[PDB]
Amino acid sequence: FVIRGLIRQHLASNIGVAKSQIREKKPIVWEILQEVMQGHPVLLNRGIQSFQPILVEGRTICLHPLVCQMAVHVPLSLEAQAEARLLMFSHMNLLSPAIGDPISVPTQDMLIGLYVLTSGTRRGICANRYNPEPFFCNSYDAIGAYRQKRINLDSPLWLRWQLDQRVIASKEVPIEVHYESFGNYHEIYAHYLIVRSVKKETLYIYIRTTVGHISFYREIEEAIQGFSQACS
Amino acid sequence: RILGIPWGFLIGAELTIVQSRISLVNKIQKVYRSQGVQIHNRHIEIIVRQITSKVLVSEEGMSNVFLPGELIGLLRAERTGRALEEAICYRAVLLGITRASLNTQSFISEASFQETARVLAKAALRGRIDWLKGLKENVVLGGVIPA
Amino acid sequence: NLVFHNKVIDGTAIKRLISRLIDHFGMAYTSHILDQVKTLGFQQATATSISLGIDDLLTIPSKGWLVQDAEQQSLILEKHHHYGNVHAVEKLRQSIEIWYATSEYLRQEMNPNFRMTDPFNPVHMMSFSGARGNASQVHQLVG
Amino acid sequence: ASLETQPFPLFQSPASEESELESADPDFYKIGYVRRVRAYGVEFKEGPDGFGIYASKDIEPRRRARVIMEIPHELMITIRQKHPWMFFPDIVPIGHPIFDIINSTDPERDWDLRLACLLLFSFDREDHFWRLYGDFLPAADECSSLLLATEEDLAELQDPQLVSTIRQQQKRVLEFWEKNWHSGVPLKIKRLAEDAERFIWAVSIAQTRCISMKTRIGALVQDLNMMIPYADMLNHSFEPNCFLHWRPKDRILEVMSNAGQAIKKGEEMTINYMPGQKNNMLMERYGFSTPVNPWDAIPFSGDSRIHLNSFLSVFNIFGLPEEYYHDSESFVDGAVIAAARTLPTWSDIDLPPIPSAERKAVKELQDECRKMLAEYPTTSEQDQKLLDSLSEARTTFATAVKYRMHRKMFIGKIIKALDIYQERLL
Amino acid sequence: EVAYATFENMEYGEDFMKPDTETYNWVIQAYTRADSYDRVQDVAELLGMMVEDYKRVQPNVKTHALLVECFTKYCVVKEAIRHFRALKNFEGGTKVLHNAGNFEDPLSLYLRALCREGRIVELIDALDAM
Amino acid sequence: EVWALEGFGVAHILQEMLTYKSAPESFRLLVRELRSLALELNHFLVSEKNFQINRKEV
Amino acid sequence: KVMTMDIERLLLSEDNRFEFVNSVAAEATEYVEKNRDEYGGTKKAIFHVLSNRVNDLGFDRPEAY
Amino acid sequence: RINEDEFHKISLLDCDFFIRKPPDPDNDVYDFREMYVTPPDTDIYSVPRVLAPMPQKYIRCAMSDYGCYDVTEPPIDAPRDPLYKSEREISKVFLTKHYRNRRLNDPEFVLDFEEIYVIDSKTKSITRARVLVTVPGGRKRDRKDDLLVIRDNGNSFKIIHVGERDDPTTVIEREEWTKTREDMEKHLRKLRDFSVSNWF
Amino acid sequence: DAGYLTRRLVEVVQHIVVRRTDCGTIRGISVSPERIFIQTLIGRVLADDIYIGSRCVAFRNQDLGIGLVNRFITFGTQSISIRTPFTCRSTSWICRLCYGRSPTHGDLVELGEAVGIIAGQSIGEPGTQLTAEHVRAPYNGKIKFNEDLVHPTRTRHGHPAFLCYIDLSVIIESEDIIHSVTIPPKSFLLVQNDQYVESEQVIAEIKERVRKYI
Amino acid sequence: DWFPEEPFEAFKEMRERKVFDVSDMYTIADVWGWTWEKDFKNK
Numbered sequence A: 001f002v003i004r005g006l007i008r009q010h011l012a013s014n015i016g017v018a019k020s021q022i023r024e025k026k027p028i029v030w031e032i033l034q035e036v037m038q039g040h041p042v043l044l045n046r047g048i049q050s051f052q053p054i055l056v057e058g059r060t061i062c063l064h065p066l067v068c069q070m071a072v073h074v075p076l077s078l079e080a081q082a083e084a085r086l087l088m089f090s091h092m093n094l095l096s097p098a099i100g101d102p103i104s105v106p107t108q109d110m111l112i113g114l115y116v117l118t119s120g121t122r123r124g125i126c127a128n129r130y131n132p133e134p135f136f137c138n139s140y141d142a143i144g145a146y147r148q149k150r151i152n153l154d155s156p157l158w159l160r161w162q163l164d165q166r167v168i169a170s171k172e173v174p175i176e177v178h179y180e181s182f183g184n185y186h187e188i189y190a191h192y193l194i195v196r197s198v199k200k201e202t203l204y205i206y207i208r209t210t211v212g213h214i215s216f217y218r219e220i221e222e223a224i225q226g227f228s229q230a231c232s
Numbered sequence B: 001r002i003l004g005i006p007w008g009f010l011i012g013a014e015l016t017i018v019q020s021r022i023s024l025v026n027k028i029q030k031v032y033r034s035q036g037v038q039i040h041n042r043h044i045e046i047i048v049r050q051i052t053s054k055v056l057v058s059e060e061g062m063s064n065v066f067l068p069g070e071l072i073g074l075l076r077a078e079r080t081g082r083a084l085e086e087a088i089c090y091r092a093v094l095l096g097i098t099r100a101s102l103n104t105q106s107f108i109s110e111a112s113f114q115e116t117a118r119v120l121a122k123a124a125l126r127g128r129i130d131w132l133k134g135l136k137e138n139v140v141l142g143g144v145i146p147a
Numbered sequence C: 001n002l003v004f005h006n007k008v009i010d011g012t013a014i015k016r017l018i019s020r021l022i023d024h025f026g027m028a029y030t031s032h033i034l035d036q037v038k039t040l041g042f043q044q045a046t047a048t049s050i051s052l053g054i055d056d057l058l059t060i061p062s063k064g065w066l067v068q069d070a071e072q073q074s075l076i077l078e079k080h081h082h083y084g085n086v087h088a089v090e091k092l093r094q095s096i097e098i099w100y101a102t103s104e105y106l107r108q109e110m111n112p113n114f115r116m117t118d119p120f121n122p123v124h125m126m127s128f129s130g131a132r133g134n135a136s137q138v139h140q141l142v143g
Numbered sequence D: 001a002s003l004e005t006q007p008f009p010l011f012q013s014p015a016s017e018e019s020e021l022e023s024a025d026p027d028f029y030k031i032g033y034v035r036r037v038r039a040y041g042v043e044f045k046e047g048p049d050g051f052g053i054y055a056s057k058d059i060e061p062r063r064r065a066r067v068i069m070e071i072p073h074e075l076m077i078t079i080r081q082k083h084p085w086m087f088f089p090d091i092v093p094i095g096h097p098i099f100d101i102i103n104s105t106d107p108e109r110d111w112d113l114r115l116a117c118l119l120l121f122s123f124d125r126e127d128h129f130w131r132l133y134g135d136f137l138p139a140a141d142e143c144s145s146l147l148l149a150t151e152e153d154l155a156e157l158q159d160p161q162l163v164s165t166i167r168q169q170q171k172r173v174l175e176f177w178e179k180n181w182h183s184g185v186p187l188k189i190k191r192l193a194e195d196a197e198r199f200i201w202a203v204s205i206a207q208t209r210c211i212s213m214k215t216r217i218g219a220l221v222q223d224l225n226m227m228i229p230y231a232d233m234l235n236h237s238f239e240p241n242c243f244l245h246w247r248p249k250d251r252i253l254e255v256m257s258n259a260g261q262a263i264k265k266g267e268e269m270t271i272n273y274m275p276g277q278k279n280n281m282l283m284e285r286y287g288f289s290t291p292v293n294p295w296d297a298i299p300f301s302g303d304s305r306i307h308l309n310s311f312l313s314v315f316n317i318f319g320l321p322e323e324y325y326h327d328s329e330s331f332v333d334g335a336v337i338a339a340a341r342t343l344p345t346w347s348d349i350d351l352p353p354i355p356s357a358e359r360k361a362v363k364e365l366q367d368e369c370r371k372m373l374a375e376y377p378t379t380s381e382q383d384q385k386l387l388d389s390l391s392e393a394r395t396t397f398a399t400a401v402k403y404r405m406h407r408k409m410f411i412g413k414i415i416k417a418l419d420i421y422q423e424r425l426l
Numbered sequence E: 001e002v003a004y005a006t007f008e009n010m011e012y013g014e015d016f017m018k019p020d021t022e023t024y025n026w027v028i029q030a031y032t033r034a035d036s037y038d039r040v041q042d043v044a045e046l047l048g049m050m051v052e053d054y055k056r057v058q059p060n061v062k063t064h065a066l067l068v069e070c071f072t073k074y075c076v077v078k079e080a081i082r083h084f085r086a087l088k089n090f091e092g093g094t095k096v097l098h099n100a101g102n103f104e105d106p107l108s109l110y111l112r113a114l115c116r117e118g119r120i121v122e123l124i125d126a127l128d129a130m
Numbered sequence F: 001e002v003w004a005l006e007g008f009g010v011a012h013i014l015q016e017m018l019t020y021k022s023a024p025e026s027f028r029l030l031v032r033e034l035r036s037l038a039l040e041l042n043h044f045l046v047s048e049k050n051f052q053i054n055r056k057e058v
Numbered sequence G: 001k002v003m004t005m006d007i008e009r010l011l012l013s014e015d016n017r018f019e020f021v022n023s024v025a026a027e028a029t030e031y032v033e034k035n036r037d038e039y040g041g042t043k044k045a046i047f048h049v050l051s052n053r054v055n056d057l058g059f060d061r062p063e064a065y
Numbered sequence H: 001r002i003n004e005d006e007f008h009k010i011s012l013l014d015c016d017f018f019i020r021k022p023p024d025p026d027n028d029v030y031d032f033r034e035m036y037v038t039p040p041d042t043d044i045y046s047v048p049r050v051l052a053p054m055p056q057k058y059i060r061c062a063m064s065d066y067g068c069y070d071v072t073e074p075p076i077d078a079p080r081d082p083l084y085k086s087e088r089e090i091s092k093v094f095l096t097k098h099y100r101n102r103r104l105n106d107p108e109f110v111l112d113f114e115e116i117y118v119i120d121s122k123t124k125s126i127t128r129a130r131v132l133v134t135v136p137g138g139r140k141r142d143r144k145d146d147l148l149v150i151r152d153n154g155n156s157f158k159i160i161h162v163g164e165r166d167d168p169t170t171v172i173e174r175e176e177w178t179k180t181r182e183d184m185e186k187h188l189r190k191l192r193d194f195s196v197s198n199w200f
Numbered sequence I: 001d002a003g004y005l006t007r008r009l010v011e012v013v014q015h016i017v018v019r020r021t022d023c024g025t026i027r028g029i030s031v032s033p034e035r036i037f038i039q040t041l042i043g044r045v046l047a048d049d050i051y052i053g054s055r056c057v058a059f060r061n062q063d064l065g066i067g068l069v070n071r072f073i074t075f076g077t078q079s080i081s082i083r084t085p086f087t088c089r090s091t092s093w094i095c096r097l098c099y100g101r102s103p104t105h106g107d108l109v110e111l112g113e114a115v116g117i118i119a120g121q122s123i124g125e126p127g128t129q130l131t132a133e134h135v136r137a138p139y140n141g142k143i144k145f146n147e148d149l150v151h152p153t154r155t156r157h158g159h160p161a162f163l164c165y166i167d168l169s170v171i172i173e174s175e176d177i178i179h180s181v182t183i184p185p186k187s188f189l190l191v192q193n194d195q196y197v198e199s200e201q202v203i204a205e206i207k208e209r210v211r212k213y214i
Numbered sequence J: 001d002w003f004p005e006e007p008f009e010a011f012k013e014m015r016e017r018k019v020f021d022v023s024d025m026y027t028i029a030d031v032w033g034w035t036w037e038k039d040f041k042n043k
């Protein structure tokens, strides 16, 4: 395909000249090799799965950790290249067929990272020496306060959950409610607070959470948004 | 004895084969389940369908249609038992894996598996036709895979 | 779309999440969502550390008493085996079974001990999340 | 915006009384967009004739048909066309009295009553999409379906057979309501249609908006009658630029613009509700008529006949009788195609038309058409006057007037067609 | 095999393409006149499938004639006599089984089978049917 | 790997990997050695149009 | 990056994945027969087929994205 | 049986209560005699278990729900079924008298926390809350500064001065602490040395 | 062992391909009564309708989704009849309905899918992975029980013990309160009427034939 | 799970499980209407 590329650019007049330039390994050869590799898939074989190669520095083949002496193969015909790209990609095969079990699930460091990411607050006796938190109006204010070292990853905070649908719960009745004489009341729960009134309506939920939990939710929401950006 | 020669063989095969299927699906999947290595039954059931696929014609089944000891599919045996009066008789057989292969009509799938010389000798004496279908017998011929 | 968790990601919980994502969005979204959660996991693992030290491992504190118990019984039985009160098969079966019993207890009290008394212990998080080291392997280090 | 109640279609457009296509309320699209509806290159517009879909951009031609809309199955309503009643959004709880009522319908005569029961139940089922969508359905005073008419309108319909069929439909509906909304029904039924007007409205909507298709729900290939909350806003045409199509993997109804057709900004996106039904059938079910209806018929009994093939060629009509179409090669339209399907006609292998006897036949059939027009008390343009100015926009009455007018206008086009055919036969 | 491929296309297709009696006749004819191999088990399978289709397929003259052809070209006379005893009820059944005297002659083969197998009380019935 | 590729149904890659990347000449060897054992491994294909029994080049 | 969502869209469009991929291979080989421009550099016939088909779906993707 | 045209349909989780109402522009007034309970849509009625003295006169009340949330989190089928569902489960309702039956817009509008009626979905029952008042002044105190705390699954009611109100943070912290203290004792008790150890 | 098993299974089922939409089978495998009752149904197709009274709840050749199985187990509809591969009319190929939901999609399995070899692999490769309770004193204190209620025995270890075939209540007089423990029938109580017991000490316990040489 | 050892109870299970029932017990003499064959076979 490098020879065919050198013919396509007319930089070699015959296949022997193309082979001679390939032997000379001049930068032109690597530019045409980058042109050839662009959009051409290859099979990797341990266990046999196909990927888009990208020309990389060094000499040892580089593989993605979740897809991880691998052998390498080029599909030669156009029908084979089509079948490879449309059937044989990891995108097409995220499920193990034996029951339909997701293969690529976060594992090793990432999972324990996510575990710590989602460990969040120290609870109760582990958090206060004796028996007896900021509010953030949106999650980017909380992340900003974390970056500015006003709060730590483990530390409890309140986020205004103005998307006041989709509140998570444990089927637990309110741990406490406060009613003001003027008919506002606050419901306090082990995980969140709701301010609502007999006149007017619910003002806001405030969820008691951590920078870690916020980041876990936000980076998935922003991954969905980043993918669906192309839907525009 | 209870159902006589027109039906007793057919329903005896049916009851044997369904009991066997239930027993094999249980005894096999019970291992995986007790080991916690879960699997869907639809993968086991194709193998058990092959193990219980055949019946054999017994001596009292000697006929010009089927000879004794011949192995025929359960569908073939049921349908010919409905259709013909020609002394049809058969009994279910639990064809083990290594005997479901070497009794798979595409002779290349037999020969390239095991007993290659014996398979080829019989099939050449039988003049057998492998009407090429299925995958193992197609990759040898370098085909497009009938799948 | 997805519910806010406010709860720790167990390996079973993330298996549920990823399966539900594949079933809801198909491959199209989930192959990006999971590939970004990779980077999130790497980031938070790098900001943390899961380093293991000689006193990050954490022998269950009553092990000494339990071993002394199993030791004293064995000594008494060995004494009584010399006296001809106990035959060799009973002594053998004690030597097997009382130490198997102790080893099992020591395992069944390893996880509660971490979760109640050192929740953020490295090998606790390693085994309870399922990253590396089965509970048996952690116990064979610790217990 | 996954909440709220009472969004409505601004009634500034249905204010034609003093004497045109403003955008629909953005919430009308938003309630879909939040629920994975997508409109591509089209806009909902609100005329005094209600909603329509219009192209908001010029769309280039494409080799396959091009998607213009996607509606997800979760927002639809469905009844099985054949006896074993099942609901694939499965709104109705098992053992709900609605299932007993819906079973008491005739398997094939009363599909509209079944759909009306589902529609009403879907207005009662909170946080079903139609709880919000019902505000955008035409109310009982603005629906065109003649099930809401009365004798004051049907006297203006002047079509006794169609009057009789409308009367039978109304009788059937009201008898069903009286039988199944008697005082003994549970409150969770009586609250669906506490009066006859609510039920006859629901039936009129079910009739005017029922799509039907063969579909695949997973493995099950099946016949459904269904309501699709944004494909039912497509207006009828017998020359449609779009068609509905089903995707079973993600259970999407596509609205597809026809392959190889370009379309223009402001063009109405239309579909062929039922192919091959006379205007009286469109009045019976949907409650409208169109003058270019290429399947309409005329009660000719004449032995005068015209050379069919010459009638085609003088108007450059092409194709088989099931297929007749017109091309670029300009008054020729669906009414002339209807004429070719309807006039007493003769044909022979190659034999030419008698230039004299065809003019004689033209004269005879023209005087037949003239006496047919003379059977009405008024001309076409008198009804045009009675529609360019009108007392109160009484929708059923205006629909009956549109019907009569369309028929006369048609027969007029028949006269003009025979005139131009004779002249252009030279 | 090339006929049975179409039959297998039909029998496991949509209802509008399910085999009819003629489809069974043509595939039984294909098997019974095969050049090179024993087809009796296939013909018996096809017959059993036709019986399994009893709600939709009923036999005709040509079906019984082809089956008598099969069960007499191969020595299966105890079943041939039964199919001929059914063919008896159709006028011209023996004309069809004579098949104008080509593809050998199934009627002659049947009469010879009855002769050499001594089934004369069936042979006189075949002669009366002729 | 053959089992995996044919599991994906990705059989043109399987054909490439098993034939022109190195009837195929190895099937020619197979038939020739059986033909040397005095067995005629004979390959036919049947014309769908004409029923003609075309003998393959083997 | 994005092109595989188009692939998935077309996989979702066509009623058989294998028949879809067969039709893509057919379209590419007929393209490379009806046109004999070399068309083999930074853009590839498979991506061209996917692009043209998603453009038929109405989506603003350029030839080989 | 009974019609609902003049009844408040107080929908709880396990049943709907029907409470007769007089006409008022705000629909704000309750009969507290014509009490009925109905399975969620069964249109069948019986008198609920009144467990307390109830006012035999038309009076006006605010209403609020002591419901939990629950994440139904159902299994999802192929047509993009939503990977979450969450719904309010009204286990209990509070009806709070208005002081002097003042209307919501009156300048001196105050909730009369002395008179709270509690409706329980699962015992199908009505009760009058035995609230405790911590405020100095008995019946003649300024009621604008009163704040009601409800606790113990809505079984405990305490009127406290507005200033005192514990912060939500310290409430949750104190509940976590009083839980984890008992869990930690229940764990440490298995050790031999527990009998000779200090809380530390 | 795993490698041999995989080779043999694939060689047996190399020919099962989804060649047809519907073999037209008129029969099904019956299923009736729990996680196994789920897994045996999910992604099958019904061989026959199911009705709950007059309410039709599922129809022939409909897919079993989780909601339908949940309805079935809610309303007790036994005899759920499903088109398993055993129901199919061919042994040399399978039709997509008799296989049901795809191994890797939400819709039916796909015509041409090598579900045979997929099954063979999916069974062979997991082959690589295949391979009395003690009651203990929860508190320090004094054991108390009426030891006349229980039979004397010699334990497997030669220790004397009591063997009990009743619900026995054992008190532990701890330093704070009279804790208690329930001992089930058929159990070896290793302790005695007034023994001092220490926390986590075992208090009760609830072939080959081999030569031992002295 | 096992079918009964007694054949008749095994037939009752065959009915109840619908693995085999009397409606599948049919043959040509009962299918193509060869009502005469009753008079031939048993004599």
Ligand SMILES: C[S@@+](CC[C@H](N)C(=O)[O-])C[C@H]1O[C@@H](n2cnc3c(N)ncnc32)[C@H](O)[C@@H]1O
Binding pocket: D049, D050, D051, D052, D137, D138, D143, D144, D145, D208, D209, D232, D233, D234, D235, D236, D237, D286, D287, D288, D289, D290
């Ligand atoms: C499928 S419903 C659409 C609902 C309608 N857009 C509305 O505003 O409620 C068809 C209705 O649109 C109108 N309609 C249908 N076909 C039409 C046509 N060809 N020209 C004008 N109006 C038409 C009639 O009032 C008919 O009841």
Ligand SMILES: [Zn+2]
Binding pocket: I022, I023, I024, I025, I087, I088, I089, I090, I094, I095, I097, I098
């Ligand atoms: Zn099947």
